[PDB]
Write a protein that binds this ligand. Structure first.
Ligand code: CL
Ligand code: CL
Ligand code: CL
Ligand code: CL
Ligand code: CL
Ligand code: CL
Ligand code: NA
Ligand code: RU
Length: 129
């Protein structure tokens, strides 16, 4: 599913991301834009052989199992394919664990490089939330 911007904002809100660990909704939308372009089916291979999956490009070295990332963990206890679903529940639940684990949203390199410090509220402009 390719979400629309306000559509994804709405979905993230309902699932409890707005201000989760102090990160306003625009931060999560902005991360999604630059990680996946709002595409639940996005996958990208990393240099280390792991892969990132779904709207928030959650990484198989630590968070989900894809069966091909040696020496990896599955801290979200989920197949990485579950992160590609049209229903963003699994991705949000797993993101919640990621953002709680010490470095906040800096875990998302695209968030740190393209969202952090910017006017992220622009991402929810015009949305009925
Ligand atoms: Cl915001
Ligand atoms: Cl891929
Ligand atoms: Cl694996
Ligand atoms: Cl699995
Ligand atoms: Cl959803
Ligand atoms: Cl980046
Ligand atoms: Na893994
Ligand atoms: Ru849902």
């Amino acid at each position: 599913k390719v979400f629309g911007r306000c559509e994804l904002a709405a979905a993230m809100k309902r699932h409890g991301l707005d201000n989760y660990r102090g990160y306003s909704l625009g931060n999560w939308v902005c991360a999604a834009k630059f990680e996946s372009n709002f595409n639940t089916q996005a996958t990208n291979r990393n240099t280390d052989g792991s892969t990132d999956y779904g709207i928030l490009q959650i990484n198989s070295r630590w968070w989900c199992n894809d069966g091909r990332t040696p020496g990896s963990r599955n801290l979200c206890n989920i197949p990485c394919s579950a992160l590609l679903s049209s229903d963003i529940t699994a991705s949000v639940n797993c993101a919640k664990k990621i953002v709680s684990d010490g470095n906040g949203m800096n875990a998302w390199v695209a968030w740190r490089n393209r969202c952090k410090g910017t006017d992220v509220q622009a991402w929810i402009r015009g949305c009925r939330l």
